[PDB]
Amino acid sequence: MFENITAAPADPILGLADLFRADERPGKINLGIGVYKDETGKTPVLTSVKKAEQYLLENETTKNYLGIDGIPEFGRCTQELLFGKGSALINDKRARTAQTPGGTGALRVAADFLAKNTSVKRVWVSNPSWPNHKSVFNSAGLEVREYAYYDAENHTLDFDALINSLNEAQAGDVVLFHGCCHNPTGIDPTLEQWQTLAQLSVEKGWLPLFAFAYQGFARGLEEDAEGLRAFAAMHKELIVASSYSKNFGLYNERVGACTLVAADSETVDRAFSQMKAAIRANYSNPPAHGASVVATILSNDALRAIWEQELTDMRQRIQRMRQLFVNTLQEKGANRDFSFIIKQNGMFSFSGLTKEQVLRLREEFGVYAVASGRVNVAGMTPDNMAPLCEAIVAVL
């Protein structure tokens, strides 16, 4: 019976969204979005994926079920993207990929797989992290500890406080790393940090879990995988949960992958069978469409060139807006160094605004940002950059 079921709390971004769409004043700016937007303020479906969908509409003959792990070409392509085209990981066939419902679905089936097939009980998540990670790991029954990350002062990666809290993590604990475009701070380890982290991870026996949602948004496709690759070269095991939601603009088709690396193929196959069991008891087998679109873009040279170009344009649009944000702020006139905004990667960064300030922003100007001061740079267009900077100036 359900009469004393407690309502679910407000989830941050979600609530803000309809609070936004209640504001009678169309001068309003929703910087709390979380999805990419172009200079029009729209989230278009990529030309390459439109081409790949006319193609599938022309060529699918059955909608019969995929295998639990999804379409194989999709798996193989996510492994080259992740590990690099000649990776020993791929040649020794130490990695296995399950196509999953989104990068979140990949984290939930890594979560269940691990919860029921191993000794891990703790997952270390950065402070702060994308908030839904916690919920996923706890629904699985694992507990989430947090490690320090952000220097809420220098606006950088507090590497010391990070290895310092990581030292409470024991062997066989999972430490989640964001592979590139750290949500929420857009602050990422440099390759030298990633490498000493790879080294301290094998030292302390950490099980790395890479949450890789924005490959291609920080510097480029390979560059962004350079951290995971520094880890993978040194680890016998690691798990990576990737998403194609932002970077192929396929948010609602739920396209992502959970990759298992194990020491050798014999072990990766035996753990993967239990990862398949976990998927079976969850949604049985994955959605073919968005993944079918990713596998035919990535395996066609014409189409993958057009996609790449569409992704580097996304990536460059966000890089012009971090710069144009810093300039229109340092010209609508206040004192700050917002220069840290230029250093950070991907769509998000903490502007360093207080809740009293972001609330002010929202009531007095109609600029909507998450209570953490996390601003999504892609909701900025050259047209709204000056009302937005004005507003931020006026509340500083």
Ligand X SMILES: Cc1c(O)c(CN)c(COP(=O)(O)O)c[n+]1C
By CB under 6 A, the residues from 149 to 208 that bind ligand X are 178, 183
Return the number of the residue (132 or 195) whose C-beta is nearest its own copies: 132
Question: Which residue, judged by CB position, is nearest to ligand X in the bound state?
Answer: 102
By CB under 8 A, the residues from 320 to 339 that bind its own copies are none
Cβ proximity of 114 and 200 under 8 Å: no
In a 13 Å sphere around the CA of 41, the CA atoms on its Cβ side amount to 12
Interface with ligand X, residue 290, by CB under 6 A? no
By CB under 8 A, the residues from 207 to 266 that bind its own copies are 207, 236-237, 249-254, 260, 262-263
Q: Rounded CA gap, 155 and 21, in Å?
A: 31
Provide the angle, in degrees to the nearest 10, between the axes of the packed helices 72-83 and 288-298: 60
Provide the angle, in degrees to the nearest 10, between the axes of the packed helices 47-59 and 288-298: 110
Ramachandran region, residue 80 (left: φ > 0; alpha: ψ -120 to 50; beta: rest): alpha
Determine which residue in the list 94, 96, 108, 182 makes contact with its own copies, applying CB under 8 A: 108
Q: Count of residues binding ligand X (CB under 6 A)?
A: 15
Interface with ligand X, residue 97, by CB under 6 A? no
The answer to whether 15 is annotated as binding is: no
Question: How many other CB atoms are there within 10 angstroms of residue 388's CB atom?
Answer: 24
The interface region with its own copies, picked from 21-29, 58-66, 74-82, 343-351 by CB under 8 A, is 58-66
The answer to whether 366 is annotated as binding is: no
Determine which residue in the list 75, 105, 184, 379 makes contact with its own copies, applying CB under 8 A: 105
Interface with its own copies, residue 306, by CB under 8 A? no
Q: Rounded CA gap, 347 and 216, in Å?
A: 12
Output b/e per residue, 257-282; b: 16+ Cβ within 10 A. Answer: bbbbbbeeeeebeebbebbbbbbeee
By CB under 6 A, the residues from 250 to 269 that bind ligand X are 251, 256
Site map 212..231 versus ligand X, x via CB under 6 A: -x------------------
Q: Which residues are annotated as a binding site?
A: 34, 130, 183, 374
